[PDB]
From a paper:
There are two major types of galactolipids in chloroplastic membranes: monogalactosyldiacylglycerol and digalactosyldiacylglycerol (DGDG). A major percentage of MGDG is further galactosylated to DGDG, a process that is catalyzed by digalactosyldiacylglycerol synthases. However, during phosphate shortage, DGD2 is upregulated and synthesizes DGDG in the outer membrane of the chloroplast. Herein, we present the X-ray crystal structure of the integral monotropic membrane protein atDGD2, bound to its donor nucleotide-sugar substrate UDP-galactose.
Numbering used by the authors: 7 to 132, 138 to 162, 170 to 394
């Protein structure tokens, strides 16, 4: 059995359709009696500078491949055991997105084709039901919610997917309806986050001081990613949140507008460049504030919980999975946000059961995936 996983982004672009399909591949290919190939976009150097930390650019696919293997080997315990292939892509800046150039199916000879996983089937289907036996799409994005919010897809998405995908996994119910679909959060968290939570637990037990008493958000700096709602909440409740310090981390097109809004508040809210969420600078924040209502599943929330933090997030259907965790505090309104945030700053995060830590893991996500995709 051979699984070909086609996605719309690659490390070092720190975005869900880069990070999650990469872990998926790592943990599928460990499952043992199964060959995994991950198929990722190659950008020319001009486009690479747009999405990579231009610290990081590759003059060939082979370099990018060494870099992606290194990055993932640094993060998982085991030796990787899947293959990596590239298709040519082009970053369309107005789509905020990588568009394929060839038939991407081409990356996989006919002679080895078996099962195809399309991360973001909507774009990747702009060959399929006829070149592979079995095609599974995974919906990572709320396409509708992001184009309907630029300073339609809709019915084409339905049939596009339906024509090409035998099964459709929606990461949550904050998505378009789709044919042959199941809701299932088939993502976990980089095991580094769980390791960081076990280290913060051990510090708590040692009474080191695990935590500083401010908050942070991390995510690409576009208004529609939570920033707009966070800044309005902050601005509405400035007076009650006088003691709150908030650090915001990300890159993107709105970073200068967000900065500008931040310095008009009577709160210390600071804006900084994007950075890997697993970096040591994040390790001691006690509270992660996530007000996105446009994510399908907020991988960053999963990551923050794994690290042992308290997450204050919107009481919205995309956060339904996280509500099983006691350190996840949901709010229906501005008052709820403030009360939840003030209580969290004041208190100790609670500790995660072993059953919780497992539920956030890629080992668990893979089992769910294997199960909802009839791959048994
Ligand atoms: O500055 C950053 C930004 C992101 N990340 C990492 O990137 C991954 C995804 O981050 P986000 O979910 O903030 O990035 P995207 O919004 O760009 O992810 C996309 O897909 C996800 C699911 O795969 C989400 O559900 C969302 O709908 C969609 O835009 C996480 O591992 C997060 O830690 C960083 O390390 N640093």
């Amino acid at each position: 059995q051979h699984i070909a996983i086609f996605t719309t982004a690659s490390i070092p672009w720190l975005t869900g359709t880069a990070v999650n399909p990469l872990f998926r591949a790592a943990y599928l290919a460990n499952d043992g009696e199964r060959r995994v190939t991950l198929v990722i976009p190659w950008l020319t150097l001009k486009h690479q500078k747009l999405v990579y930390p231009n610290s990081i650019t590759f003059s060939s696919p082979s370099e990018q491949e060494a870099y992606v293997r290194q990055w993932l080997e640094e993060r998982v315990s085991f030796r990787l055991a899947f293959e990596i292939r590239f298709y040519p892509g082009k970053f369309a800046i107005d789509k905020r997105s990588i568009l394929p150039v060839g038939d991407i199916s081409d990356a996989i000879p006919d002679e080895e084709a078996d099962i195809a996983v399309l991360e973001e089937p909507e774009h990747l289907t702009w060959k399929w039901k006829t070149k592979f036996n079995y095609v599974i799409g995974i919906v990572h994005t709320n396409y509708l919610e992001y184009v309907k919010r630029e300073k339609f897809l809709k019915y084409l998405n339905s049939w596009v997917v339906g024509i090409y995908c035998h099964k459709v996994i929606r990461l949550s119910a904050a998505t378009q309806e789709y044919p042959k679909s199941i809701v299932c959060n088939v993502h976990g968290v980089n095991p580094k986050f769980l390791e960081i939570g076990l280290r913060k637990l051990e510090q708590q037990k040692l009474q080191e001081q695990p935590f500083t008493k401010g908050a942070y958000y991390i995510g690409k700096m576009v208004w529609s990613k939570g920033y707009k709602e966070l800044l309005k909440l902050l601005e509405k409740h400035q007076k009650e949140l006088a003691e709150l310090e908030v650090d915001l981390y990300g890159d993107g097109e709105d970073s200068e507008e967000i900065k500008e809004a931040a310095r008009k508040l009577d709160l210390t809210v600071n804006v900084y460049p994007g950075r890997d969420h697993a970096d040591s600078l994040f390790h001691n924040y006690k509270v992660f504030l996530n007000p996105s209502t446009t994510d399908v599943v907020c991988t960053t929330t999963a990551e923050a919980l794994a690290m042992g933090k308290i997450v204050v997030c919107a009481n919205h259907i995309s956060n339904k999975f996280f509500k099983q965790f006691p350190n996840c505090r949901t709010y229906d309104d501005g008052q709820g946000f403030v009360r939840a945030t003030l209580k969290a700053l004041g208190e100790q995060p609670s500790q995660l059961t072993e059953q919780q830590r497992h539920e956030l893991s890629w080992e668990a996500a893979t089992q769910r995936f294997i199960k909802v995709s009839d791959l048994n």
